[PDB]
Each structure stands twice: as C-alpha cells, then as structure tokens.
C-alpha cells in the first residue's frame, strides 16, 4: 500500500472545473472552468495569476492541453484550435482562439503587456505627435484607461501585474495606420526608444491576423522587396527557401536570418543577403562566417550590433500572437477530438464528418496536411467482413501520432454499420487507423491507410469507444483507455489495452496481439482522465512508471503500468456546507509543488503529495586506502546541466543563459530572479557571472543572496531577506 499525503486545498472558482493543464516553465496551472474561462494560477505561493476568455464564441467547450516537448499550449473549442506559448514570462491568452478576420474594418482585440503599453504612452505623449492620424484619440483614451486600471494592481503583486494585459477593441485598419504612423514618426527623428519594436510587433501581429493584408513573397531576380513588409523575422527567414548553402555550418537560414538579413539574389544560385535596416552589400558567404560577427565587422553602425531598439519583430511575439486556424477552409465543421502522441511536434484536428487537418505548430503556424477520411476503405471493408447496399459511418474519438521512420497519425475510429440480425441493427466497432504524414521527397502516399488495427471482442460486445490514447514513457508501449459510448446488463467502466509498437518495417505500426488487457468491472470507476509519473521522482520485467487516473465518482487511482494493480487510492473530498462528493474530474502533475493537482466537482484544487539517520555504511570510518580516496575524488566532480532549465527575470532585463540590464528605476531597490530546475536532482552549485559598467570609479556595495523557494500552502539584513531568513540556503555575500 502506497501512502498519499493531503495537506489542504485551495479555492479557484465557484463555477466548477472540468479539465486541468499545467505549464512547467512558468509553474502555472491553467484550470479550465465549466463556463469556458481559463484561470491561470501560480504554483509557488497559491496566489492566482490571471483569468482569460480566449476571445472565443460564448458557450463553447474550451479544452486546454500542454506539450512540454515543444513547450506549447493547445486550446480546442467546437470551432477552431489555437496554439500559444510563453512571451516574456507571461501567456497571451486573451486572443488565443481569435478567429482571423476577412476585412480591414473588422474590430480586432489587441492584448498588450504593461511595459510595452507604458512605453507606447510615453512616446505618444512626449516624443511622437500623431494627432492627425485616424483613430488616435480612441487609442489614446483606451491606453490611458488600461494603464490607469493596471497601475493599481502593479504595486500589489508583480507577477499578477505582468500577467495583466490591456485589451484594445479597435478596428484593424485604424490600428495598422496608427502603428505605421508611430513607426514613421520614430524613424524620422532617429530616436531609438522601446516603443518602436513594440509598435512593429503590434503591426506585424495585426498583419498576421488578417490574411487579406498578406501579399505574396516576391523572391526573385530583378525585383526589389518591400522593406516595410520585411520588418517581420518570419518573412526574412522565409526568403531563404532557395538557399543553395543550407549544408554550411554557419550559413544556415535560421541562425543567419535572426540577425536581420533577407535573401535578395541577383540570379539563381547566389548567396546575396542584405540587411533590412542598414542594407549592407554582402556576397560570397563562407561556412565559417558567423552572422553576428559578420554583421559587426561589415556594419558596426547597425543598431542590431549595438543592441539598440529597432523596428525588428521577434519570432516569439508572432508565435505568441498567432491566430487560430480552422481545420477546414469552410470553417463550419465541429472538431470531434484532438491530442498528441510520441511525436507531438505536429498537431492533429479531426472533424465529425471525417476530415483531418494536421498543422506544424513546432514551426510557424501553417497548413501542413489536410485530407478527408473515407469510411469505405478496402482494409476497413475486409475488417468489417471479418467481424461478421452497405452503409458505414466512421467517427474519430481520439487522435495520436506515433513515431520511433517517418511519423504516422493514429486515429481511434468508431464504425457504425447496419447489419442483419442473426430488421437491420446498427452495430458499432472501434478500430485504429494509421495514416501517412510525411510527404514524398512503393512508399504509401499521404492520406492513405497504413494499418487497420482491429480491437478485441469485448470492445465490440460492449459497444465501447476509444476514449484516450497515450504513448507510455518508455516509447515502446502504448495505452488505450476505453469507455461506454452513449446511445443517441453489467455496466463497465472501460478497458485499459496496452499494445506493443512495431518497428520491423520503415513505417511505425502496431501489433495485433495486445500485450495487456485490464478490465474496469466497477461502473462507478469509469476513467475520465489519466497522467503518467516519471520514475525518477521515485528515485529521490522493468517497471513502466505509475499512472494516475480520475474516476466518475472522484476516486483518484494510482496504479503501476506493468500490471494495472491499485497501488494508491485517494477518496474524493466532501463539498463545503454539505456531505456531497466533490468528485475529481481532472488531474495533472505540478513539478513546483511536486504534487498531483486535481480539480474537484465544485471547482476546488487539491494537491496530493507522494512519498513519506543510522544503519548506513559511511565513507569516513574506513582506512585511507587508495581506492576509497579515488572514489571520493571521482564523486566530488561536477557536471553541466542539460537540457535548459527554467527561469524568469524582472522585465528590466532583456535578452547557460544571459541578459542585459536596461536603465529602469521602477524597481531599482530589489531584484528577484526565480529559477526552477527541470528535475529535482543533486544540486552541485550555481555560477553567477556579471559584467559591470565601464565607467565605474568606486567599488559598489551590492549583495546577491540565494534562497530556497518556499512551497505554497495547500549590520542588519534587508527586509525581504528578513522575511525569508529561516529558509535561507546561501550567502549573504
Ligand atoms: Zn545591418
């Protein structure tokens, strides 16, 4: 029996909670309410960060999911799918599911942070005179009221202030004209202020939200490009599609495009890349030519070399302000299911009519594949023949992508067909369909069937439907959780089918024989949501980790993935003011709290903790032999952390990680940087490198102190350190 500790609970909303999602970089829980709003809560102190409505249609069923492999958040409604990511430590969730407009006069929602809005207001009131521009008074008044509402919350909590964004409701063409006027007015005065890149990013986001204001990229000889259209980084890196030197080490499109260069070739096959700010003539590129060093040498007066603020638009701002594309061009079909698998770089979306669109959300948001599933495939036909005019209706209920060898799409389909009774009866059968993803550069064509896996007899007998598909942490096994499909005896709670992936051929396939079948004989224990726990947390036939599932009645079950035996049981809490069951609906894992965070029926959040000195052979009492001292010395070495950790800084610092400080006196007295490791392991040390001012004539009395971040509740030192003096772990130095 495994021990689970309960140390309290928190109240998020009184409207209830349905699904949960956790962002590991910002330690933020994105709880999904039953009314469609997304409530972002911090995971370090219990103080809620923000609330969002995603600018979607009212009454829509918002479903939010997170991917840590690509570090992107997917929001799926009944209409469209939106992709978001972190931007300067906050998530721009106000316009996450914004439908792209078709005309210039449509009112668009423009969400902006606090420092950007303050710089825009300071420029418009001090350095920029744009009173002749259309819509100037409305934008000025909206900026003023947004800043005057934000400044009250600014002095209370810094993280809630940074998460708070001002949403302007203005027409698209008016905002575009205002931003163009700001860019021109700041360009004619030759002043390098912070409002210029803000306005450039704003106008690039507005141009990206409207496909009608996106002219075609005219990359060709004898034709100049539009520099104002080339202010975006994505267009500059798109211009290198015909680059003949992709195989070069440093002359690659992605590292060389971010320096502010675009391909303007005079012929077909050359390497002429011009800057979009200083217009430096560069030819005969070399594989050893570092882009930053070449831009510094050939143009030291370029503001990118000095780091000054230009009209550049970073790709992170465009990705954080990307629109929500519909799975079809008609935009009227409703999405039945979504998800991600062992290759989550591509995002799949299937409609109820049988059309699947796959987007490359890992790269820039574009159309990657679009096809329609035909239910009358020969493999489906012969599987239905082996099961027993001809009418077949196929509906997808789960989506996954499996990869070890190009990736393939796994769709969990349900086939309903009229069969004679041995009057016609509509029988349902769940199957798995494999479709090709990667296009051709006799291999199968994309959009065609690869493997038609047939589920065993109990799925057809009980009319079960494929509820969830999840690849295991090993990468060699796959789990399918079923449930009773409602119709428009002994009721079962579903089945857990563990399959083995097949990599015998060049295409990712599965095996017909299931490697494990587990039954849920209790109808009350119907599986609603699942999560997988990494085994290294327990390190503080090989075992395949632990699986945490939520039931219909709210009983959280933690089971070993090898045999699906009930190891840990968590009863649902009781509602306040009564004896009703506050049944758990969804569960996620919070790394910052190191706890299972589960949402209740009443909207509460509960954190469950997993896990709970003599008799050791020490390394001291032994005699001083050579091997023991050698093992002690080999123990005391240090290694570099890989991959990248997580960290956030105050916005006065702009960007193994480095930053540059800007002269801001709003919070000059204190600076708090937060660090979250990707995994709790053996802490060696932290290296803190600094470069000071060149005009320093006196030794500064400035101290840096490391502190253990406190877990949230479920000569005299500085007062902030006095507040956390007991839990200190380094310094003062
Ligand atoms: Zn330049």
XYZ file of C-alpha atoms and ligand atoms in Angstrom:
734
model
C 0.000 0.000 0.000
C 1.358 3.387 -1.074
C 0.969 6.393 1.226
C -0.527 9.636 -0.114
C -0.460 12.802 1.998
C -3.123 15.521 1.985
C -2.059 18.934 3.287
C -5.067 21.121 2.483
C -6.852 22.546 -0.537
C -7.459 25.818 -2.358
C -10.469 27.553 -3.899
C -10.122 28.693 -7.519
C -13.680 29.448 -8.666
C -17.276 28.795 -7.643
C -18.356 27.911 -11.205
C -16.698 24.479 -11.177
C -13.746 22.951 -13.004
C -13.670 20.309 -15.741
C -10.169 19.915 -17.219
C -6.687 20.769 -15.969
C -3.388 21.753 -17.566
C -0.012 22.712 -16.092
C 2.738 24.784 -17.699
C 6.139 23.676 -16.344
C 8.185 26.715 -17.407
C 6.112 29.328 -15.549
C 4.809 26.954 -12.812
C 1.271 27.968 -13.799
C -1.895 25.867 -13.623
C -4.311 26.630 -16.476
C -7.562 25.448 -14.926
C -10.498 25.210 -17.336
C -13.812 26.337 -15.866
C -17.201 24.968 -16.886
C -18.135 28.384 -18.330
C -15.226 28.425 -20.805
C -12.831 30.731 -18.951
C -9.225 29.720 -18.276
C -7.950 30.598 -14.801
C -4.142 30.777 -14.584
C -2.895 30.185 -11.028
C 0.687 30.449 -9.791
C 2.222 27.326 -8.271
C 4.693 28.909 -5.827
C 2.535 30.885 -3.370
C -1.112 29.993 -4.051
C -1.868 33.460 -5.460
C -3.813 33.371 -8.714
C -2.135 34.951 -11.743
C -4.799 35.810 -14.320
C -8.149 34.983 -15.906
C -8.875 34.636 -19.616
C -11.753 34.098 -22.036
C -9.645 33.361 -25.185
C -11.851 35.771 -27.246
C -13.853 32.751 -28.418
C -17.556 32.278 -29.077
C -19.801 32.175 -25.981
C -20.944 28.773 -24.788
C -18.051 26.930 -26.416
C -16.452 23.930 -24.722
C -12.866 25.029 -24.107
C -10.361 22.180 -23.739
C -6.757 23.054 -22.889
C -3.694 20.817 -23.188
C 0.044 21.353 -22.745
C 3.062 19.900 -24.553
C 6.475 20.078 -22.881
C 8.376 18.547 -25.815
C 7.524 21.596 -27.950
C 6.549 23.777 -24.934
C 3.246 24.856 -26.484
C -0.333 25.116 -25.224
C -3.227 23.928 -27.403
C -6.756 25.275 -26.904
C -9.567 23.434 -28.699
C -13.136 24.726 -28.943
C -16.055 23.493 -31.040
C -14.935 25.787 -33.896
C -11.155 26.320 -34.104
C -7.845 25.345 -32.497
C -5.324 27.852 -31.156
C -1.655 27.442 -30.258
C 0.136 29.607 -27.695
C 3.497 29.803 -25.943
C 5.358 31.886 -23.379
C 6.265 35.506 -24.130
C 8.427 37.438 -21.625
C 7.255 35.210 -18.778
C 3.506 35.548 -19.454
C 0.980 33.805 -21.693
C -1.029 35.988 -24.091
C -4.288 34.125 -23.520
C -6.691 36.987 -24.299
C -6.627 36.349 -28.072
C -5.550 32.699 -28.022
C -8.534 31.446 -30.064
C -9.154 34.598 -32.109
C -10.820 33.864 -35.438
C -8.869 35.537 -38.281
C -10.839 38.407 -39.801
C -11.521 38.835 -43.524
C -11.890 42.626 -43.885
C -9.807 45.602 -42.790
C -12.709 47.263 -40.938
C -13.317 44.381 -38.514
C -12.720 45.166 -34.841
C -9.777 43.115 -33.547
C -8.762 42.529 -29.937
C -5.216 43.735 -29.223
C -3.694 42.458 -25.969
C -0.577 44.260 -24.749
C 1.665 43.949 -21.666
C 2.367 46.714 -19.147
C 5.879 47.908 -20.032
C 5.043 47.964 -23.750
C 1.882 49.992 -23.087
C 3.774 52.404 -20.819
C 6.463 52.931 -23.469
C 3.770 53.490 -26.115
C 2.005 56.077 -23.939
C 5.281 57.833 -23.080
C 6.247 58.024 -26.760
C 2.785 59.219 -27.829
C 2.706 61.897 -25.107
C 6.345 63.059 -25.268
C 8.161 62.129 -28.490
C 5.504 61.154 -31.076
C 2.998 63.672 -32.477
C 0.388 61.652 -34.384
C -2.717 63.757 -33.719
C -3.502 63.837 -37.461
C -3.738 60.029 -37.663
C -7.187 58.447 -37.739
C -8.396 56.831 -34.530
C -5.641 58.459 -32.469
C -7.972 59.753 -29.738
C -9.711 56.393 -29.232
C -6.412 54.503 -28.949
C -5.018 57.170 -26.604
C -8.085 57.018 -24.335
C -8.040 53.204 -24.310
C -4.324 53.216 -23.458
C -4.921 55.737 -20.662
C -7.760 53.788 -19.044
C -5.906 50.482 -19.407
C -2.774 51.885 -17.778
C -4.767 53.575 -15.003
C -6.527 50.273 -14.273
C -3.263 48.308 -14.411
C -1.218 50.657 -12.195
C -3.401 49.891 -9.163
C -2.640 46.167 -9.494
C 1.014 46.914 -10.315
C 2.038 47.942 -6.785
C 0.341 44.916 -5.169
C 1.732 41.839 -6.959
C 4.452 41.872 -9.611
C 3.519 38.577 -11.289
C -0.185 39.466 -11.469
C 0.850 42.855 -12.878
C 2.991 41.235 -15.581
C 0.216 38.762 -16.408
C -2.374 41.554 -16.638
C -2.760 42.698 -20.249
C -4.689 45.603 -21.771
C -7.150 44.564 -24.491
C -7.907 47.268 -27.063
C -11.114 46.840 -29.089
C -10.379 48.864 -32.230
C -10.720 48.355 -35.999
C -7.855 46.618 -37.771
C -7.100 49.239 -40.435
C -7.179 52.046 -37.853
C -4.663 50.217 -35.648
C -2.474 49.448 -38.673
C -2.469 53.113 -39.729
C -1.691 54.214 -36.156
C 1.218 51.768 -35.883
C 2.560 52.817 -39.296
C 2.371 56.464 -38.206
C 4.234 55.601 -34.983
C 6.928 53.760 -36.961
C 7.344 56.633 -39.433
C 7.384 59.305 -36.706
C 10.001 57.418 -34.685
C 12.048 56.749 -37.832
C 12.131 60.378 -38.999
C 13.501 61.576 -35.631
C 16.270 58.902 -35.450
C 15.410 58.105 -31.819
C 15.979 54.567 -30.514
C 13.163 54.164 -27.998
C 11.475 50.996 -26.746
C 8.098 51.904 -28.283
C 9.359 51.313 -31.839
C 9.789 47.490 -31.588
C 6.506 47.337 -29.649
C 4.658 49.133 -32.453
C 6.420 46.994 -35.070
C 5.388 43.786 -33.284
C 1.839 45.137 -32.914
C 1.511 45.938 -36.622
C 3.068 42.591 -37.581
C 0.551 40.795 -35.352
C -2.270 42.802 -36.950
C -0.979 41.899 -40.418
C -0.793 38.230 -39.395
C -4.359 38.199 -38.035
C -5.704 39.367 -41.420
C -4.872 37.071 -44.375
C -6.195 39.713 -46.801
C -3.291 42.033 -45.862
C -0.587 39.419 -46.579
C 0.989 39.975 -50.015
C 2.934 37.177 -51.659
C 6.682 36.941 -51.055
C 8.287 38.061 -54.312
C 11.735 36.467 -54.065
C 13.318 36.768 -57.499
C 15.993 38.488 -59.577
C 15.407 41.987 -60.887
C 12.654 42.759 -58.360
C 13.148 44.656 -55.112
C 11.372 43.506 -51.963
C 9.179 45.589 -49.659
C 11.287 46.596 -46.657
C 8.254 47.620 -44.583
C 6.754 44.182 -45.225
C 10.155 42.639 -44.409
C 10.189 44.013 -40.848
C 8.906 40.634 -39.647
C 11.512 37.970 -38.907
C 9.399 35.169 -40.403
C 9.401 36.791 -43.856
C 13.190 37.186 -43.686
C 13.646 33.514 -42.803
C 11.098 32.587 -45.490
C 13.214 34.373 -48.113
C 15.952 31.727 -47.608
C 13.874 28.901 -49.120
C 16.025 28.816 -52.281
C 19.293 28.997 -50.319
C 21.941 26.806 -52.023
C 24.125 26.677 -48.880
C 21.890 25.067 -46.254
C 24.568 22.422 -45.641
C 27.016 25.090 -44.461
C 27.714 25.153 -40.730
C 27.042 28.846 -40.057
C 25.287 29.900 -43.290
C 22.020 28.213 -42.238
C 18.682 30.045 -42.664
C 17.568 30.080 -39.016
C 20.767 31.336 -37.266
C 21.592 33.820 -40.051
C 18.056 35.186 -40.509
C 17.647 36.266 -36.867
C 20.486 38.785 -37.330
C 18.243 40.811 -39.656
C 19.035 39.573 -43.165
C 16.948 38.640 -46.196
C 17.778 36.861 -49.450
C 17.729 39.253 -52.425
C 19.587 37.309 -55.127
C 20.579 38.901 -58.420
C 20.390 35.487 -60.128
C 19.524 31.848 -59.365
C 22.071 30.145 -57.107
C 23.937 33.047 -55.454
C 24.196 33.976 -51.763
C 23.427 37.709 -51.697
C 21.843 38.502 -48.313
C 21.047 42.131 -47.481
C 20.220 43.749 -44.158
C 16.743 45.253 -43.846
C 17.966 48.198 -41.734
C 21.435 49.264 -42.932
C 21.318 47.481 -46.346
C 24.877 46.139 -46.258
C 26.007 44.532 -49.521
C 27.201 41.022 -48.629
C 28.385 38.432 -51.161
C 30.480 35.221 -51.246
C 29.365 33.817 -47.905
C 31.544 31.254 -46.131
C 30.708 28.264 -43.888
C 32.813 29.822 -41.097
C 31.030 33.198 -41.361
C 29.244 33.779 -38.064
C 26.213 36.028 -38.754
C 26.575 38.265 -35.686
C 30.338 38.638 -36.184
C 29.934 39.339 -39.910
C 27.251 41.948 -39.200
C 29.516 43.531 -36.572
C 32.545 43.618 -38.889
C 30.787 44.759 -42.073
C 28.397 47.193 -40.327
C 29.386 48.203 -36.783
C 26.974 51.159 -37.053
C 23.994 48.807 -37.441
C 21.749 49.126 -34.347
C 21.494 45.327 -34.077
C 25.239 45.236 -33.370
C 24.900 47.861 -30.629
C 21.697 46.199 -29.404
C 19.581 49.334 -29.804
C 15.817 49.179 -30.280
C 14.837 48.972 -33.964
C 11.716 48.055 -35.947
C 12.563 44.344 -35.661
C 9.775 41.883 -34.862
C 10.942 38.775 -32.956
C 9.515 35.394 -33.902
C 8.407 34.742 -30.308
C 6.000 37.695 -30.450
C 4.488 36.397 -33.700
C 4.158 32.883 -32.266
C 2.551 34.274 -29.100
C 0.134 36.320 -31.256
C -0.595 33.700 -33.921
C -4.257 33.314 -34.958
C -6.371 30.183 -34.567
C -6.766 28.496 -37.951
C -9.797 26.351 -38.698
C -9.308 22.697 -39.735
C -11.192 23.424 -42.978
C -11.495 26.452 -45.238
C -15.280 26.499 -44.775
C -14.993 26.957 -41.008
C -18.338 25.321 -40.193
C -17.434 21.749 -39.183
C -17.096 20.955 -35.486
C -13.988 19.255 -34.111
C -14.626 15.870 -32.509
C -11.261 15.137 -30.873
C -7.594 16.109 -30.689
C -4.394 15.143 -28.918
C -0.708 14.386 -29.289
C 1.432 11.276 -29.069
C 5.077 10.211 -29.233
C 5.718 12.844 -31.947
C 3.831 15.899 -30.637
C 5.511 18.433 -32.955
C 2.512 18.138 -35.311
C -0.994 18.967 -34.073
C -3.932 16.994 -35.478
C -7.596 18.014 -35.628
C -10.390 15.732 -36.851
C -13.981 16.742 -37.578
C -17.139 14.690 -37.130
C -17.609 14.385 -40.912
C -14.241 12.659 -41.359
C -11.778 15.432 -42.280
C -8.364 15.633 -40.594
C -6.037 18.640 -40.721
C -2.504 18.486 -39.306
C -0.613 21.702 -38.532
C 3.119 22.198 -37.949
C 2.836 24.040 -34.646
C 6.501 23.317 -33.860
C 7.429 25.687 -36.694
C 5.384 28.740 -37.724
C 1.622 28.138 -37.776
C 0.841 26.971 -41.319
C -1.140 24.349 -43.226
C 0.884 21.128 -43.264
C -1.616 18.397 -44.228
C -5.344 18.410 -44.995
C -7.314 15.335 -46.055
C -10.646 13.549 -45.638
C -11.092 10.049 -44.221
C -13.148 7.677 -46.373
C -15.007 5.023 -44.381
C -15.211 2.666 -47.400
C -11.514 1.768 -47.466
C -10.722 -1.814 -48.579
C -8.962 -2.639 -45.298
C -11.905 -1.258 -43.304
C -14.275 -3.209 -45.573
C -12.427 -6.500 -45.077
C -12.188 -5.904 -41.313
C -15.957 -5.353 -41.188
C -16.397 -8.512 -43.281
C -14.229 -10.485 -40.838
C -16.273 -9.001 -37.976
C -19.429 -10.685 -39.279
C -26.213 -1.792 -50.271
C -23.716 -1.136 -47.468
C -23.784 1.886 -45.145
C -20.801 2.698 -42.910
C -20.401 5.830 -40.770
C -16.983 6.431 -39.200
C -16.369 8.879 -36.348
C -12.986 9.628 -34.767
C -12.909 9.827 -30.964
C -9.177 10.182 -30.198
C -6.084 11.445 -32.012
C -2.437 10.480 -31.562
C 0.816 10.470 -33.539
C 3.275 7.606 -33.018
C 6.946 7.609 -34.012
C 10.056 5.669 -33.018
C 10.945 6.123 -39.868
C 8.609 8.981 -40.762
C 5.844 9.807 -38.251
C 2.321 8.490 -38.741
C -1.098 9.561 -37.474
C -3.081 7.131 -35.310
C -6.834 7.782 -35.323
C -9.180 5.954 -32.978
C -12.275 5.455 -35.097
C -15.723 4.008 -34.460
C -17.587 2.371 -37.352
C -21.389 2.173 -37.234
C -22.985 -0.087 -39.829
C -26.367 -1.694 -40.450
C -26.227 -5.493 -40.271
C -28.918 -8.192 -40.386
C -29.780 -9.706 -37.018
C -28.700 -13.327 -36.590
C -34.733 -5.719 -39.228
C -31.245 -4.249 -39.579
C -29.379 -3.317 -36.392
C -26.741 -0.577 -36.212
C -23.598 -2.207 -34.805
C -20.578 -0.223 -33.608
C -16.949 -1.349 -33.775
C -13.865 0.573 -32.578
C -10.689 0.306 -34.677
C -7.349 2.084 -35.034
C -6.333 3.651 -38.351
C -2.770 4.542 -39.347
C -2.220 7.302 -41.908
C 0.955 8.614 -43.511
C 2.114 12.102 -42.515
C 5.449 12.899 -44.176
C 5.105 13.629 -47.888
C 7.198 12.141 -50.679
C 10.521 13.907 -51.227
C 6.442 1.823 -53.417
C 6.063 4.027 -50.355
C 2.446 4.861 -49.424
C 1.069 8.286 -50.297
C -0.137 10.669 -47.561
C -3.819 10.457 -46.721
C -3.923 6.690 -47.332
C -4.308 3.896 -44.805
C -1.200 2.207 -43.399
C -2.579 -0.223 -40.803
C -6.155 -1.030 -39.758
C -5.833 -2.473 -36.255
C -8.925 -4.308 -35.001
C -9.793 -4.127 -31.315
C -10.638 -7.399 -29.490
C -14.089 -8.861 -28.934
C -15.025 -7.151 -25.653
C -14.837 -3.705 -27.276
C -17.387 -4.720 -29.921
C -19.573 -6.674 -27.477
C -19.936 -3.788 -25.006
C -20.057 -1.120 -27.780
C -17.090 0.669 -26.222
C -15.470 3.706 -27.827
C -11.818 4.752 -27.797
C -11.726 7.464 -25.137
C -7.995 8.128 -24.756
C -4.758 7.140 -26.496
C -1.443 7.747 -24.729
C 2.095 6.554 -25.514
C 3.982 5.274 -22.495
C 7.126 6.872 -21.085
C 9.277 4.023 -22.432
C 8.399 4.758 -26.064
C 7.893 1.057 -26.832
C 4.369 0.572 -25.397
C 1.052 2.334 -25.973
C -2.060 2.589 -23.791
C -5.674 2.857 -24.954
C -8.408 3.656 -22.439
C -11.974 2.860 -23.463
C -15.377 3.931 -22.169
C -19.042 3.173 -22.766
C -20.259 5.053 -25.831
C -23.630 6.724 -25.132
C -26.572 5.783 -27.343
C -28.468 8.625 -29.014
C -26.817 -5.809 -18.050
C -23.500 -5.111 -16.300
C -22.168 -1.610 -16.951
C -18.371 -1.496 -17.164
C -16.029 1.409 -16.503
C -13.943 0.800 -19.627
C -10.836 -1.154 -20.542
C -7.095 -0.483 -20.493
C -5.404 -2.051 -23.526
C -1.598 -1.958 -23.567
C -0.250 -2.540 -27.088
C 3.321 -3.032 -28.293
C 4.694 -0.779 -31.025
C 6.060 -2.487 -34.143
C 9.202 -1.102 -35.805
C 10.022 -4.043 -38.085
C 9.401 -2.040 -41.271
C 10.184 1.572 -42.193
C 6.690 2.721 -41.116
C 5.581 2.927 -37.486
C 2.966 0.215 -36.905
C 1.432 -1.709 -34.004
C 0.919 -5.365 -33.111
C -2.382 -7.213 -33.440
C -1.886 -9.065 -30.149
C -2.395 -6.782 -27.120
C 0.334 -7.127 -24.522
C -2.020 -6.321 -21.625
C -5.797 -6.245 -21.119
C -7.235 -4.742 -17.923
C -10.950 -4.590 -17.112
C -12.760 -1.986 -15.014
C -15.593 -4.063 -13.565
C -16.884 -1.137 -11.478
C -19.164 1.219 -13.460
C -18.511 3.889 -10.814
C -14.769 3.773 -11.642
C -15.084 4.903 -15.271
C -11.809 6.506 -16.343
C -12.103 10.207 -17.215
C -8.507 11.486 -17.262
C -5.036 9.992 -16.892
C -1.450 11.132 -16.381
C 1.936 9.395 -16.253
C 4.505 9.939 -13.499
C 8.237 9.709 -14.332
C 10.083 7.013 -12.356
C 12.954 9.316 -11.311
C 10.630 11.018 -8.805
C 10.559 7.639 -7.052
C 14.384 7.641 -7.210
C 14.695 10.504 -4.695
C 10.161 -7.045 -16.323
C 11.133 -3.394 -15.952
C 8.609 -1.079 -14.319
C 6.853 1.362 -16.657
C 6.173 4.117 -14.126
C 2.875 4.946 -12.461
C -0.444 6.075 -13.934
C -2.823 8.413 -12.091
C -6.455 8.233 -13.217
C -9.626 10.035 -12.160
C -12.898 8.122 -11.899
C -16.504 9.243 -12.321
C -17.028 9.226 -8.552
C -13.810 11.133 -7.895
C -11.617 8.303 -6.577
C -8.064 9.035 -7.738
C -6.305 5.752 -8.537
C -2.520 5.454 -8.872
C -1.578 2.138 -10.476
C 1.602 0.505 -11.713
C 1.679 0.468 -15.511
C 3.136 -3.062 -15.603
C 0.118 -4.897 -14.156
C -2.545 -2.181 -13.510
C -2.836 -3.051 -9.817
C -4.355 -0.456 -7.484
C -1.370 0.859 -5.525
C -2.691 4.180 -4.181
C -6.298 5.224 -3.567
C -7.414 8.803 -2.872
C -11.035 9.325 -1.879
C -12.752 12.449 -3.236
C -13.189 15.271 -0.711
C -16.531 16.406 0.651
C -18.103 19.650 -0.529
C -18.236 22.583 1.864
C -21.501 23.166 3.717
C -22.825 19.677 2.902
C -21.933 15.996 2.527
C -21.957 15.887 -1.285
C -18.986 14.297 -3.034
C -16.602 16.863 -4.534
C -15.641 14.395 -7.242
C -12.318 14.859 -9.015
C -12.716 15.467 -12.752
C -9.142 16.017 -13.976
C -5.624 15.551 -12.606
C -2.229 16.998 -13.570
C 1.259 16.950 -12.049
C 2.783 20.117 -10.580
C 6.582 19.979 -10.509
C 6.976 23.153 -8.449
C 4.778 21.794 -5.668
C 5.884 18.220 -6.570
C 2.272 17.117 -6.139
C -0.708 15.719 -8.014
C -3.003 18.709 -8.576
C -6.605 17.611 -9.112
C -9.721 19.677 -9.796
C -12.940 18.911 -7.940
C -16.588 18.987 -8.988
C -17.065 22.290 -7.139
C -14.025 23.981 -8.684
C -11.607 23.429 -5.799
C -7.986 22.370 -6.294
C -6.358 19.642 -4.197
C -2.643 18.832 -4.034
C -1.762 15.245 -3.103
C 1.826 14.520 -2.058
C 3.513 11.225 -2.958
C 6.249 9.834 -0.726
C 6.748 9.754 3.028
C 19.694 8.548 10.008
C 21.519 5.389 11.102
C 22.289 1.980 9.654
C 24.235 3.304 6.652
C 27.734 2.323 5.524
C 29.530 5.666 5.732
C 32.514 6.913 3.718
C 34.541 8.111 6.729
C 35.316 5.275 9.164
C 37.240 3.188 6.619
C 41.060 3.348 6.497
C 42.749 5.626 3.972
C 43.107 3.197 1.094
C 43.817 4.379 -2.440
C 40.568 3.129 -3.996
C 38.327 4.776 -1.384
C 40.034 8.159 -1.795
C 39.875 7.749 -5.583
C 36.136 7.032 -5.375
C 35.723 10.079 -3.121
C 37.574 12.266 -5.639
C 35.605 10.869 -8.599
C 32.442 11.520 -6.577
C 33.288 15.197 -5.982
C 33.315 16.175 -9.672
C 30.635 18.354 -11.261
C 28.645 18.151 -14.495
C 26.858 20.686 -16.682
C 23.063 20.719 -16.638
C 21.398 19.610 -19.884
C 18.809 20.479 -21.222
C 17.859 24.088 -20.487
C 16.371 24.901 -17.078
C 13.521 27.343 -16.388
C 13.940 30.895 -15.105
C 12.147 34.226 -15.100
C 13.568 37.696 -14.528
C 12.004 41.137 -13.998
C 11.216 42.887 -17.308
C 14.063 45.401 -16.846
C 16.443 42.689 -18.124
C 16.353 41.991 -21.863
C 17.889 39.035 -23.678
C 23.819 28.889 -19.717
C 21.657 31.993 -20.088
C 22.428 35.700 -20.413
C 20.638 39.040 -20.104
C 21.316 42.757 -20.489
C 20.022 45.305 -17.981
C 18.137 48.407 -19.105
C 18.108 51.638 -17.105
C 14.798 51.370 -15.223
C 14.312 52.900 -11.768
C 10.833 51.495 -11.061
C 12.231 48.558 -9.041
C 15.852 49.600 -8.537
C 15.883 48.737 -4.819
C 15.265 44.985 -5.121
C 15.627 42.351 -7.828
C 14.196 38.828 -7.549
C 15.064 36.203 -10.169
C 13.289 32.845 -9.948
C 14.839 29.533 -11.021
C 13.004 26.230 -11.499
C 15.070 23.163 -12.343
C 13.714 20.663 -14.899
C 14.163 17.893 -12.308
C 14.910 17.713 -8.582
C 18.415 16.234 -8.529
C 21.763 16.627 -6.761
C 22.459 20.370 -6.665
C 26.143 20.973 -7.317
C 26.420 24.766 -7.430
C 25.191 27.837 -9.294
C 27.562 30.008 -11.347
C 26.619 33.701 -11.436
C 28.574 35.763 -13.983
C 28.312 39.549 -14.195
C 29.865 42.347 -16.244
C 29.675 45.808 -14.690
C 29.782 49.352 -16.068
C 32.921 50.573 -17.823
C 32.825 53.975 -16.063
C 32.953 52.562 -12.519
C 35.168 54.575 -10.164
C 34.012 53.120 -6.819
C 33.502 49.584 -5.509
C 29.729 49.034 -5.213
C 28.134 47.676 -2.045
C 25.721 45.308 -3.792
C 24.860 41.842 -2.480
C 23.387 38.716 -4.065
C 21.729 36.056 -1.905
C 20.313 32.668 -2.904
C 17.214 31.389 -1.108
C 15.134 28.221 -1.177
C 11.774 28.969 -2.777
C 9.093 28.156 -0.217
C 6.444 25.602 -1.111
C 2.927 27.090 -1.320
C 0.435 26.441 1.449
C -2.216 23.945 0.385
C 24.688 45.323 10.219
C 21.134 44.122 9.561
C 19.810 42.208 6.569
C 17.363 43.616 4.040
C 13.671 43.183 4.987
C 12.885 40.864 2.062
C 15.667 38.553 3.240
C 14.412 39.032 6.808
C 11.033 37.696 5.656
C 12.801 34.504 4.497
C 15.721 34.400 6.937
C 14.943 30.954 8.373
C 14.683 29.213 4.982
C 17.910 30.734 3.616
C 20.402 28.420 1.917
C 23.302 30.616 0.701
C 25.059 33.872 1.491
C 24.803 36.777 2.317
C 27.891 37.543 0.182
Zn 22.565 45.869 -40.811
